[PDB]
Design an enzyme around this catalytic site. Structure first.
Site: not given
Length: 188
Positions: A100-103, A105
């Site tokens: 996922p493109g969530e830093a 995470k």
């Protein structure tokens, strides 16, 4: 008659919902008594029925829920990295879902991927993996990515991350060979 079984097969609705509302597909696959209330069974389910959205499993196995940071831990400790080079673990780890493109995470998984890697020499600490786990993420990303005409070189890949474990760097070899693995193959 004994096709009482074909009724659990209805565990298709649970993945029908899971693929959009994951916090539901699982909630439901228990209200019917299909999934383990405990977590190890969720890092497991997320490991079994592979008709799960490969990008829904991603986001799920990496949220900030007490239930999650573990549902994922049980998922990280379901993947054996026994007797194989770093590149592989990542390869075979980061294939059970899509990153996922969530830093905030990535670092969760990359912390318990690294930290757990160093449980099962060329590594100083587990913060070299979580910091090398990236050079490899930014590796395939740059190279195996059409648009950035100029692809990253060798004396650039290695010479870049000069010092991934302690003050000193990683053998200019682990970096070479690891270079031709990703230059050859794309984890994504």
């Amino acid at each position: 008659f004994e096709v009482i079984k074909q009724q659990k097969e209805i565990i298709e609705h649970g993945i029908e919902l899971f693929n959009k509302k994951p916090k539901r597909g699982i909630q439901f696959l228990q209200e019917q008594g299909m999934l383990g209330t405990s977590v190890e069974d969720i890092a497991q389910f997320l490991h079994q029925e592979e008709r799960l959205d490969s990008t829904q499993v991603g986001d799920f196995l990496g949220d900030s829920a007490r239930f999650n940071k573990e549902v994922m831990y049980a998922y990280v400790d379901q993947l054996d990295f026994c007797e194989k080079e770093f590149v592989s673990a990542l390869r075979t780890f980061l294939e059970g879902f899509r990153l996922p493109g969530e830093a905030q995470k990535i670092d969760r998984l990359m912390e318990k991927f690294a930290a757990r890697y160093i449980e099962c020499t060329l590594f100083a600490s587990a913060d070299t993996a979580y910091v090398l786990a990236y050079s490899i993420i930014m590796l395939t990303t740059d190279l195996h990515s059409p648009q950035v005409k100029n692809k990253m070189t060798k004396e650039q890949y290695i010479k870049m991350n000069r010092g991934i474990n302690d003050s000193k760097d990683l053998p200019e070899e682990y970096l070479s060979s690891i270079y031709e693995e990703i230059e050859g193959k794309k984890i994504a």
